[PDB]
Each structure stands twice: as structure tokens, then as C-alpha cells.
Design a protein around this ligand. Structure first.
Ligand code: ZVZ
Ligand code: ZVZ
Lengths: 306, 306
């Protein structure tokens, strides 16, 4: 007896679902536009149905809002509309959270019940590099205390409170730092997706996940994520590290053997221990856990029983 | 701009709430035999409408279950029925959690949608006195570590897994201990109410409130609860303290004057610190906070925006 309904990929594919679910050509162009590594078969067979499932929870919450408001005789202090529906997306560095989040964002927006779907990464809530240096935390970027938790909690509370205006800072992956001045404005979307390492982490009191209506954890074997991380580092020699401005420009000239050593050392000393200590223990808190094969294909889905 | 909608008693009274769905006199009879800190008026004006509000959420979750099962084409690995809807009830010792829980049990059971409503206290998950002594915890009964959290978590997981059978140990207040070999059986009820000081407490990983569909915190001024605690202690001289076998039999003989001194000392040294450190910070985690005045009448309701 488990708290989850479990499917492997084969079972999932074989399901006789009650839809009518197919992507539009307009959508296939859009979905290429947000990467390319993303397998379109993945999107059609797994993420599209997953989106419909989530859509059922969003519509249910919107109708509960209406039934409750009617029951209360719409008092003045009740909001006139449902507050945004907030989805957490958690998992290891390099597991593909950002891709999953971006795919879900594009698929969920296609229902007229909730056409406005925003995406915020908690990367924008990291303390900037100097502030991290000050705190002896440069080697722990992505650990819980490397983020401004108070600011993160204020932002999510503002959105959940039904504010028409809420503001998040922005992180540059190119520069490895917060862009001073930069802001992302959120204006009462129907759905907000909140993607990050730390979204399902707990705290002594009200925590950001107390405000989630749904959450995903993107999972994979630790050895496989290590390989993805190493490949990403090697591929970065051409992109992020190629700029003579980069603080990591020296890595561009590392040949495959030395690059694998540098990548694995960084994995072993920062990202892997952050996963073991801080991220993995949050995995059972997710509404939906998606596990990936070594080839990046989803091999298993666990959904909390309703 | 807040995550909750707030009503004081006068506004709650003023509301044009849909349909009385009023109470039979034979039900009101049963309602007397479980309250005293819940008056007839409180049932009529507060608790009954609250039960309707909660019923709306239970019904929504039942229908979401069915929509979801149908979308998936009711596969083998999906349960045939929704798992139990679990309601947490938290607050200070002597705030009236047990009475609130018993009233909600009686009211929520009045719908055909969910006639089977179980009630479990976390007192059953206290370590037995022998284990508490071993652990230097005799002065800390009700504090987070005084409970076998692992066993509590296992019980709630078993219930949310849709088990046909889940067992909780039993705590005797009269004997001030777990009853050996005693168990409460819970058999897939439609709704389980889990009542306890500690039900909204946080932890490093999966916590019991992760498994809740709705939660209530019973609130009051710290000085008002102290007075209720004192009255309670004084009353126990005639009842639980009367038995020469009681661990607290020596308190039976205290005059009113001296009993007040003892009660306030116990409040000051155990229960109040527990409230300040461990119980009060969980208050913002509740879906619904009910605040009571000095004579036990609700003066304020704060409900999470839907
Ligand atoms: C995005 N970059 C890579 O994947 C591979 O490149 C590096 C290179 C250096 C470092 C690094 C160097 C020195 C220290 C020290 N002291 C620490 C790291 C990191 C490390 N990453 C850790 C995870 N970081 C996070 C974590 C959460 C959100 C955004 N970024 C990105 C930097 C990644
Ligand atoms: C069962 N008794 C009462 O409610 C009121 O009287 C007393 C008397 C003594 C004590 C007491 C005496 C000595 C130590 C030591 N060392 C500790 C307590 C307590 C203390 N209560 C704290 C809260 N306890 C809880 C807390 C949660 C669930 C069930 N019981 C009941 C005992 C309550």
C-alpha cells in the first residue's frame, strides 16, 4: 500500500485516455522554439496528458472558488477571482527542471480556463556573488542559505494573496550572478510555475510550498545526473566558457579528459552533496514525481492518490 | 493584502449564507453531550456553516478523483474510490481542540457524500512514560520529541494510501499513559480528523500536514487559555485526580487556593513554553484559524483564499 498511483512509461503509453489530445502545428513550432533537445514524442505522449491532469486540478480549484463565494453570498472581503494556482518544480541541478517547467508552461496556457501562465525560477532569489563571498557561501551556491529566503517567501505570498503586482529579481546564467536592476513582474496570472532546487524545502514556520497547489519533482538515478552534468560542462566550453570575459574562460581550453575531471570535481564537491542533503529528502513532498532514464526519457510517474 | 479572508463575528453573523440546512433536535441532544465550551449559538452560527464550507472542499476532491480516474480510463493501479480526506486540528493545550473536533465530526457526518467520519488524537502517539523517563522528557510531554513521529507519520501515510485498515495506539488521560495492547482501528473513512498540538509542526522531510486536505488552528489570547487551563486543573481534583491509583492523586487534596498556584506553575513551566516555542508558529500554516474570546465564543475567522 503506497501513497502513489504508479505507472512505468509502457503502462502510461498504453493507457486508453478519455481525450482528444493532439498538438497543433502552431504549438510544434512554439515547442521547438524553447530548445530542441526536447523530444517531441516526450511532449506528446507524456507532458500533454500530464498537462491535462494538472488542468483538471486547476479547473476544480476555480469551481471550488465559485461555489465557496456563492455559499458565502459574495461578501465584500472575499476576492472576486481565484488567486493564482501555484505549481512547484523541484529536483537536482542538471535534471531538466527548467525544460519541464517551460514545456508545462506552454501546454497549460492552451486551455481557455487558464490562458495566463507565468514562470519564475528561484535562481533570481540567490544572493548576488559579492554577498555570497561576504557570507563564506560561494562554494554553496544553490544550498538553502545561498538564497534570500525572506524575499522568496514575500514574493510567493504576494502572488498567493492575489496582488496585481509582484516582483522578482533576475539571475544571469551567462554571468553567474544576479543582474543588478533587473526585475520580473508578475500580475495575477492564472497559474504561476515556480522552478528551483529549493522549492519543496521545509522551514520552522509557513514555507513557500505551503502556498503550492501542485508540485513536481524531476528525479533520476544519481549516476545518470552526474553524466548529464559532465556533458553539460563539456558542452559549455563552446558556449558560456568561450567568452574571454567569463571567470571560467580557462575551462574552454580543457581537453575532454581534464574537462571530465574538472566537471566531476565540481559535481562531487557542490551539486551532489546539495542533492543528497537538501534536495532528495524533499522528493516525497511532491504531488507528482517524474523519473527519467539515462537517455532523458521519462520511465516512471508517481502521482499522489486523490 | 493577505493570504487569507478575514471575518470578525459580527461580519460572519451578517453574511447572507446559502441555505440553513438546519439541525434536528435529536442531533442537538447528542451535541450537548460533547461540548460546554461550544454553546448552541456557536454550533448554529459558526460550526454548522464551517462544516458546509468544509463539505464543499470534500465534495470537490471526490469529484476531482472521479474526473481523474475517467481521464486515465480507470486503470488497474488507480484506486476504486477517493482516499480519506484528512483534517488537522491544532492549538494550545486547553484551547478546546477536542471539542471542536468532536463537533466537526458530528456535523460533517450529516452529508450522504461522506457519512463515515473518524476522529484520532495524536495523544496515542506519545511515547509511553517509561520511554519519556529514559529520554529526559517527563517534563516535556506534548513537546515535538515526546511523540513517536515516525509511527505517527506511518499511520497517516497508511490512511492516505487507501488502506482498508490502519491502527493507532491509545492514550489514557486517567492513567496518564499509553494503554498497553490497546488500539484504535480506522477503516478507510470518508474523512479523518486528526486532532493534536503537534499536527501542523514542520520537519526536515515529509511531515503529517503534507498529508492534510484541510487544517484548523484554534486560537485564543495566551492569558485566556491560562484561565481555562486553571479551571480545568481545579475540576480534575474531583475526577481524574480522585483515584488513589492516579500518578496525580496528591493534587486531589489541594485547596482551591493552592490548586490555582500549582496549575499556573505547571502552565508557566510546561504548557505555555510549548505554546510559544512550538505550537504558535504553526498557526499561519492552517487553512482556517478560529480565534476565541475569554468565554469561548469565536470572535474571528481567517480562511485561506481559494
Ligand atoms: C552553470 N555552470 C555549470 O554547469 C558548470 O560550471 C561551473 C563552474 C564553476 C562553478 C563553481 C565555481 C566555484 C565555486 C566556488 N567557490 C562554486 C561553483 C560552478 C558551480 N555551480 C554551482 C551551482 N550553481 C547554481 C545553483 C543554483 C542556481 C544557479 N546556480 C551554479 C554554479 C559551475
Ligand atoms: C493530566 N493532567 C492535566 O491535564 C493537569 O495536571 C497536570 C499535573 C502535572 C503535570 C506534570 C507534572 C510533572 C511533570 C514533570 N516532570 C510534567 C507534567 C501535568 C503536565 N501535562 C503537560 C501536558 N501533557 C500532555 C500533553 C499532550 C498530550 C497529553 N498530555 C499532560 C501533562 C499536568
Amino acid at each position: 500500500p503506497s501513497p502513489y498511483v504508479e505507472f512505468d512509461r509502457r503502462q502510461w503509453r498504453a493507457l486508453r485516455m478519455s481525450t482528444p489530445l493532439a498538438l497543433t502545428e502552431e504549438e510544434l513550432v512554439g515547442l521547438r522554439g524553447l530548445g530542441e533537445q526536447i523530444d517531441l514524442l516526450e511532449v506528446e505522449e507524456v507532458y500533454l496528458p500530464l498537462a491535462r491532469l494538472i488542468h483538471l486540478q486547476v479547473a476544480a480549484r476555480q469551481r471550488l472558488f465559485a461555489a465557496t463565494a456563492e455559499f458565502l453570498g459574495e461578501p465584500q472581503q472575499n476576492p472576486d477571482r481565484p488567486v493564482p494556482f501555484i505549481i512547484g518544480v523541484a529536483g537536482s541541478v542538471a535534471v531538466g527542471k527548467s525544460t519541464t517547467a517551460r514545456v508545462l508552461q506552454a501546454l497549460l496556457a492552451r486551455w481557455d480556463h487558464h490562458p495566463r501562465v507565468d514562470l519564475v525560477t528561484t535562481d533570481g532569489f540567490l544572493y548576488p556573488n559579492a554577498e555570497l563571498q561576504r557570507r563564506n557561501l560561494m562554494h554553496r551556491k544553490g544550498f538553502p542559505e545561498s538564497y534570500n529566503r525572506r524575499a522568496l517567501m514575500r514574493f510567493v505570498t504576494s502572488v498567493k494573496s492575489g496582488s496585481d503586482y509582484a516582483c522578482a529579481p533576475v539571475y544571469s546564467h551567462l554571468h553567474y550572478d544576479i543582474i543588478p536592476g533587473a526585475e520580473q513582474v508578475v500580475r495575477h496570472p492564472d497559474i504561476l510555475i515556480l522552478e528551483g532546487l529549493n522549492v519543496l524545502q521545509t522551514g520552522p514556520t509557513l514555507m513557500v510550498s505551503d502556498l503550492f497547489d501542485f508540485s513536481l519533482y524531476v528525479d533520476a538515478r544519481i549516476e545518470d545526473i552526474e553524466q548529464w552534468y559532465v556533458s553539460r560542462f563539456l558542452a559549455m566550453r563552446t558556449t558560456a566558457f568561450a567568452d574571454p570575459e567569463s571567470h571560467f574562460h580557462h575551462y574552454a581550453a580543457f581537453s575532454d579528459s581534464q574537462a571530465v575531471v574538472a566537471a566531476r570535481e565540481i559535481w562531487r564537491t557542490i551539486n551532489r552533496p546539495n542533492l543528497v542533503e537538501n534536495i532528495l529528502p524533499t522528493r516525497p513532498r511532491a504531488t507528482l514525481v517524474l523519473r527519467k532514464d539515462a537517455d532523458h526519457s521519462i520511465n516512471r510517474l508517481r502521482l499522489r492518490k486523490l
